[PDB]
Structures are given as C-alpha cells and as structure tokens.
Design a protein around this ligand. Structure first.
Ligand SMILES: *[C@@H]1O[C@H](CO)[C@@H](O)[C@H](O)[C@H]1NC(C)=O
Ligand SMILES: [Cl-]
Lengths: 532, 537
C-alpha cells in the first residue's frame, strides 16, 4: 500500500495506480466519480454531486465511456479507431481522471483540465491521445480530465421544462470543475491556478465556460484548440432544440413532462439510432444535440455574449490546424474518399458547398463558390478539392476563431493565437488531407515522448516544445519560455493580428489569420443571408 | 497648280486637295488636314445622322486642322498641362465633321496598311487635332497611313429620343462610320490599302472601336481593332433607350423645351452653349466615370446590349489588341471624390473611402457597395490612408476599365478571336500629375504615337526607344494581326490571350514580360458576382 497512491478526497478515500512515463513514475487516479450516475429518472437532468463512499475506492482504471454513437464508416482503420470508445459504453459515465507527478508535488501545482471533443455527440477522457502521464511527468503538471454526457443524453433539451433543460453535458463539465476546486489540493494541485484546455467541441465548451458566469469562478485561463462557442455548429436556439427533441421523440414512439418521461423509458441505443435523423438538411460539420441558447447557462447567443462581454482579467490561447476541413469531406461529400485522392470537378464543388454551408441560400452559396474558385485555374481538380476543404475549415473553425480572438482582444483579454502545421509522420489519413482536425492533440499531450510509438526524433523535440508552451501558458498566462530568449510569441491584438506557426521550424510570427477570407465569412456573408 | 509641290495635290471623291509637307524627326511627311467628310451637321441637321459631304469645286486647302466639335471645356486647373493637353486646340463649332490623313513622303508606291484613330473623351469631348494624336511619327517612321476624324460628342453626338426620326441616337458613332466609309472609298488615293484598315482608339474611342466590331454595317469597313482602356461593354459606355429618353427630356426641360418632333425642334433652336451648360445636370446620381450622353442601345446601330452581343457573337475573323494602363482610376478621383487632390498625397479616411465607393459605383445598392468595400479593404490595415487611397483608385479603374476589358478579352477569345492583351505600366518622365496617380488613363497614348521621338519634347532616351518598340507592336499588329516581329526572336514573344491561359504582357522600359490572369480574382467579383447582387437587390 503505497501512501503516494492513497488520497482522501471530500467524499472518501481513493487509491490510484503508479504508472510508467518514459522518464519516471506518475501517480494516476482514474475513474473518480464526481456525480451520481445520471441514469433512469436522472436522464436529461442536471448532474447531482456524488454521495460519500465507505472504505477505499479503487481508482486505478478508466471508467465507462458516456453513451454515444460509434463510428463504423472505416472499420479496422487507425485514423478512426483512435477516436472510438476504448471502454464500455454506459449512461453511468460521470467520472474524472487525475494524473500528478510522483511523488505528489511539494507545493501547489498549476492544474490543466482537459475537455475532449467529438462534436458533442462522442468522445471520452480515456482515449490514449488524452493520456496525461507525459505532461504530469515532464512538466510536473497536475492534469485532470472528465467524462461528460454527449448526444441526446447530454444535450437533448425541451427548453423551459424542468426535466430536460438542455446543456446538462456542460453542467457535467462544470461539476467536474467544481470538484477540482474542492478536491485538487489533496493531489498537490493549485485550485487557484486552473487552466482549461479543449479541442473542437471541447474548445467550444471551454468557450462556453468563458461565457457563463457560474463557471468563471472555477478556472483562470483557457485554451481553445480548433473550436469556439461562436460559429455555425456550437449552439442552437431554444426553438430549434425543442424541434429536434420533439422530432426524435416522434421517431421513437413518443406536454413536455409526458414526452420526457416516455424518452426516459427507452434503451440508450434507441436514442442513438435516430440521433442523426433530426438535422434540418443534408450537411457536414453539423450536429443534432449541442448546447442550447437557453437564457440560463448561455444568457444570450455566443455572438451576443462575446461582443458585449468584459474579458479584462482573462488569458486565452486559441488556434487551428492547417487543414481544419479535410477530415469531414469523406463523411458525406460526393467525390471524396480517403482511399484515392479525391480530385473533384466543378459541379461536385458547387454541390459540396451546399452541403458544407447548409444554411446558405443560392446567392450565398454562389458568393462562396466565387470567392474560393481560383480564377486562373477554374477547373483544376486539385484546387477545387483543396478549396472545398478550406470552405469547410474556414466557415466552421478558422473564421469563428479569428472572430473570437478579435473580440476577446478588443474587450480586454490577453490572447495568443497559433496555426498548427506539422502533419504527424504516423498519420494514416491520405496526404491530401494535410494536417486534419485533431492531429495536434497527440503532440500537446506529449505522445512522441514514448519511444514505442515510432514518432521521429524531430517530432519528439516538437512535442517537448508544445508541452512547454501549453504548461507555460497554464503557469503564467503566457506561453513564452521565461527564460530562455526562439523568437517571442507575441499576443494577438486587433491592430497587429499576430499569430505563430507551430511546426518543426522555430516560431515564425505571421499577421492576419485568413484576414481577407474571414472578412468574407464574418462580415459579408451574414448580410447576404439576412436578405432571406 | 503650277508652282506647288507635286506630292501634295490629291483627288478624292468630293474633289481636289492640297496638303502640307511636315517635318518629322526622321524626315518629311505628307499631311491632309481638315478634309470634310459630311455636310456640316448644323441648323436642322443637329441630332441627325450625318450625310456625305457634297462635292466641292477647286482645290480644297487641307493644310490646317479644322474646328473641334462643340464641347465642354475643362477649366478646373488653369495653366496645368495635365488638363490642357486634352483641351480643344481649335475653334469650337457644330461644323466639325472633318478628318485628317498622314502618309509617308513621298507617298507610298504600293498599298500601305491604314491605321484609323478614334479619340476618347468620354463621348463629351475630344478632338483629332490634339498634339498627342499627331500621326506624323507613325507615318514617317513606320510608313503608316494614319487617319483620324472628328465625331460629334455630348448632346450633339448622342442625345437621343429613341424611336424618333429627328434624334435617333448614336449619331457620333455614325459620324465615325461615315469616315470609315470615306477611307474605303478614298484612301487608295493616298497610297493606303482599303483592304487593310485597323481601328485604334482609347477610352471612349476604344468603346467606339468596340461598337464598330459589334455593329454589322461597320464590319465591312475595317479588318482589325485595337481597344486601349475601354470596352463597349461595362457600366458607362452605353445607356438603355429608356434612360436616354429620360436624360434627353430632362435636358430639354432644363433649357425650356417643354411628342418628340416638337421637343427636338425646340432643342434645335437652342444655342450650342446652352446645351453644353446643362449637359452635366442630367445624371441620375452623383458619380464619376459616367457621362450624360453616350451610345444608346437603340436596337439599330446596337441591336442589343454590348454584353448580349459579345456573349453570343461569332468573332471568327477578328484580330484584336486590348489593354489597360496601370492606374485607370486615379485621374477621376480628383474630379468628384472628396478627399482627393492633384496638389497633395490624397491620403483619405475610411469614411471618405465608403463615400468614394458610393460615387464611383453609383448604381450600387447598399449591399453591393458593402461588397466592394469588403473586397477592397485590406483587413490587416483597414484604416491605412495610403491603402484606402489606392483601393479607391482600384475600385474605379477595375469597375470601369480593367474588368470590362477582361470580360471583353475572355468573351472574344472564347469565340474565335485572336486577342492580344497588355497592361501598360510606364509613367512618362514628363507627367505633371502627382506620383500617387501612378500611370493614369490616357498616358500611354503619347508613346504609341511616338511623341518621344521628337527631341524637343524632353523625353528620356529609354522613352524614345520604348516608343519605337510600341509603334512597332501597333503597326506590326496593323500589318499582320500579330504584334510580334516575324524576323526576330532575340526579343521575348507576345502570346495571344486565351481563356485557358489568360496571358498578357507588361509594356514598360524592360523587355516584354508575360503574366497570367488579368486581375482574375477581383474581376470575378465585378463580372460574375456583382451582377447577381444587383438581380436579387
Ligand atoms: C524642356 O527642356 C527645355 C531645355 O532644357 C526647356 O527650356 C523647355 O521649356 C522644356 N520643354 C518642354 C516641351 O517640356
Ligand atoms: Cl497590375
């Protein structure tokens, strides 16, 4: 009984496991319950804090993955399996994980709280890419990650009702954050220095905690990797939530109270069976059950809230990868496969755009097509294919990010922006996809530091750099190594618009994040649509 | 006859002419100046199509330039060469239908290719007698036969009551066409080859050349065409019949002329100067690069809109050279955009930019102007006054000239024309416009005509050599439909412009450089996108 692996938290005793990191041991406490299981009558309901337990709770293994859609489009393929659940699915899934340095840190250590992505329809804190051991060992970080409910279980709302108010998955996250405040000192964590980081939907969640007052007291700094609370996919209105919820109810044989009670009687997989049949049109980068502008968790729309908010005492790190949009094209755009090179033609490109910008009117779609065509090579298939990627990436990620970065900087935040440009040597997606959404995570988490994984030795040094930026940022609100002297990463501002490229070369400062094209998405396109 | 120069007496269909032996730098040239080609369009003939000049008796003296057609005279900048060089240099008079011929001296032994110049001036001004149109250098140096004509401008040339008998519209175009007919009939008397006639023109002259390409009865009158900084398509070169009716009756109101017959008859009783004095008061919006009386789409001279006709025309037989200057927009900014001046750097504010855009794109709805502003803003430095100044020039240039030219080049190419394309990029060392104006509209002309060949003009040596190069491109093109020198490959080649490759060349002091895409991204905005934002308003 190693006394380093024994911690008493507020609800009783836990026993972690000593894990091996390439350069030393780490203490890991996996599968800590932070809420009562949201099962039976508790489905769709806000999480309640977990009741006290007797004896020593075994926290040496990952708990169950929250009930979710599982991707079986390319069975056997590493590019997809790596995001699939690696534990039993269950509605009983509200658990978190803590990695700390071994021995337990001497003085209060900055805490990093990871929030996974998965479109609010999937994900798990237990995936290997979110392994907190490297960061804990190399940098002495206390690293926390939680499961939160996804899909219908986490985000089905009948806005206004009591039994399905929506945003409960965000409430799960908030509760794990509260848990950290109350308990992280026991692990040698500093509750007074909590940095949230997250990618894609995890990024939008982080943004939502930024924009929700009861969350603000639970962290001090935020990292948003390839996603934002603003933009076309992260939220829905009360009205559209209600509509999708009632349509799912209909699709499974089901007054709010009565409808919600009927929904509660359905096996989990039944809900997951019809999850993808409620979307208003054929689309990509669009998701059925996402946080809802409810006037409660989100007091107004993200756009409204970032325009008017005060961000004086907040540091934020935001960024994107070189090819935010490639991944998605294979999931429903005629002409795209991971298996060839997807050299499309013009007609496929125009049709691709009605799918990539599903809300787009004829005119809007046209404006997009005309903006993204290379008029010197109108019909070149390579350009058209790259363009389709760019449309999807820009509209959904890069431009929402530039907008977010801009508003936060204007309204008092310290902001650092990046573009991630290194394609992992081990990638199993084709070359034409470049650096797809999600492929920076393994680097930030420090996975190349594991000799067993066959990353190049340049990649291993790259990973060490990123871990340093992130944890420097967690420590100080500033990602720069203070010392050494590596040009400096300057803050993003609305005047200079400086951001850095993250790749094998040293930091390069660039100005303007797709500045002309995001002016198109962020300023012009809205005007075009608000004429029906 | 008896004692005078045997080389200077020529007969044409209307009678006998005496010309003048003129000095060019490299030796003498023949000039026949102020040959009448129509009955003076005066009195009851105002607004009416021209009639051929009745034959005369005796020897007509053709030794001096004749009257300039009645027109508005720019007085914004007294003594200023930048404006003066374009001003009428002969008496203003409605009696102005005259043309000019320059030939080698002595006259060519065998039929020589003919270049016909059509001057610009927005259809409200111009003159074939300006110093920049001096045909002597092209005649002396390239052995060209050069012809230029006066045609009626402003109301006299373009005021229309479409449908009517007495003011059918497009008569300035008809003046031009009559001079084309005169050349077919009479040019061989000067050693010119009626079977090898190239039209060249700049700005409204270019638009004019374009209308002739698009109008059947003009087709038989020439073989090849050069369009410099102007197209018949685009937002300023034509008006709808309805709009010309509007502008013409409004002008009539302004001068106290309150059916068509009775109105036109009243207009005919008005002094020419009254018409000119009210000419600018009829435009639907505050604007630049818009002129009150211009060619009308009459379903006659122009059987449909130039856009319609270029989109669906067969241009099998057509060789066309087309291009633009580097800064088509700069000139206009100082006329009617607040913030701009010839006398300072014109560093404007964002607000003066948004206002500028409303004036320069006067047909734009609010959404359209937003699009323009959105497209032309540099989002890294959106308040930078130098960028905004240059974007304002670019908006005006792109919208009125560069993109119309790209549109013209592409449509003509896609439909069988051999098209050569250029951007002229050298600023005259003698230019008196400020440096920020770059290479303004009109400032290639003096080069193509070979003025730098005149030692007294103060051009640099490089400019003298550059002019010779340009004169060679132009006259090779007139001779053969190809600007390239056949016996020469030490120099780089000028490829045809095609829809596939979109090649054009830079004209500056440096050897030819081939570039691809004529503002291809931006012109896709003006040519493909913007029309649709005017459809669904
Ligand atoms: C050019 O230079 C001469 C002599 O150097 C000067 O006196 C004259 O005024 C100038 N003439 C022109 C045409 O610019
Ligand atoms: Cl250019």
């Amino acid at each position: 009984e190693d006394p380093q692996l024994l911690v008493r938290v507020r609800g009783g005793q836990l026993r972690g496991i000593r894990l091996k990191a390439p350069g030393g041991p780490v203490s890991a406490f996996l599968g800590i319950p932070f809420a009562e299981p949201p099962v039976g009558s508790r489905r769709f309901m806000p999480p309640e804090p977990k009741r006290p337990w007797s004896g020593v709770l075994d926290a040496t293994t990952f708990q169950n993955v929250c009930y979710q859609y599982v991707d079986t489009l390319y069975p056997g393929f590493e590019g997809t399996e790596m995001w699939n659940p690696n534990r039993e699915l269950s509605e009983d899934c509200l658990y978190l994980n803590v990695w700390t340095p071994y021995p337990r840190p001497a003085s209060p250590t900055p805490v990093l709280i990871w929030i996974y992505g998965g479109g609010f329809y999937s994900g798990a804190a237990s995936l290997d890419v979110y392994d907190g051991r490297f960061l804990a060992q190399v940098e002495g970080a206390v690293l926390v990650s939680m499961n939160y409910r996804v899909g219908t279980f986490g985000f089905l709302a009948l806005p206004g009702s009591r039994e399905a108010p929506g945003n409960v998955g965000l409430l799960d996250q908030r509760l794990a954050l509260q848990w950290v405040q109350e308990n992280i000192a026991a692990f040698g964590g500093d509750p007074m220095s909590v940095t949230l980081f997250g990618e894609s939907a995890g990024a939008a969640s982080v943004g939502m905690h930024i924009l929700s007052l009861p969350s603000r007291s639970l962290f001090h700094r935020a990292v948003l990797q390839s996603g934002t609370p603003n933009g076309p996919w992260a939220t829905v209105s009360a009205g559209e939530a209600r509509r999708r919820a009632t349509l799912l109810a209909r699709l499974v044989g089901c007054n709010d109270t009565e409808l919600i009670a009927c929904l509660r009687t359905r096996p989990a997989q039944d809900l997951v069976d019809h999850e993808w049949h409620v979307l208003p049109q054929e689309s990509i980068f669009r998701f059925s059950f996402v946080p809802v502008v409810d006037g409660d968790f989100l007091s107004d729309t993200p756009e409204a809230l970032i325009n008017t908010g005060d961000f004086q005492d907040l540091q934020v790190l935001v960024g994107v990868v070189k090819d935010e949009g490639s991944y998605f094209l294979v999931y429903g755009v005629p002409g795209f496969s991971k298996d060839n090179e997807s050299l499309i033609s013009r007609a496929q490109f125009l049709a691709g755009v009605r799918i990539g910008v599903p809300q787009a009117s004829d005119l809007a779609a046209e404006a997009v097509v005309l903006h993204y065509t290379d008029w010197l090579h109108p019909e070149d298939p390579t350009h058209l294919r790259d363009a389709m990627s760019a449309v999807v990436g820009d509209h959904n990620v890069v431009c929402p990010v530039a907008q977010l970065a801009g508003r936060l900087a204007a309204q008092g935040a310290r902001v650092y922006a990046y573009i991630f440009e290194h394609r992992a040597s081990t990638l199993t997606w084709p070359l034409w996809m470049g650096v797809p959404h999600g492929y920076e995570i393994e680097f930030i988490f420090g996975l190349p530091l594991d000799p067993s994984l066959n990353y190049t030795t340049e990649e291993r040094i790259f990973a060490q750099r990123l871990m340093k930026y992130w944890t420097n940022f967690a420590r100080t609100g500033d990602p720069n190594d203070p010392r050494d002297s590596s040009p400096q990463w300057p803050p993003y501002t609305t005047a200079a618009q400086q951001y850095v490229s993250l790749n094998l070369k040293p930091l390069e400062v660039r100005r303007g994040l797709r500045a002309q094209t995001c002016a198109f998405w962020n300023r012009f396109l809205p005007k075009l649509l608000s004429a029906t």
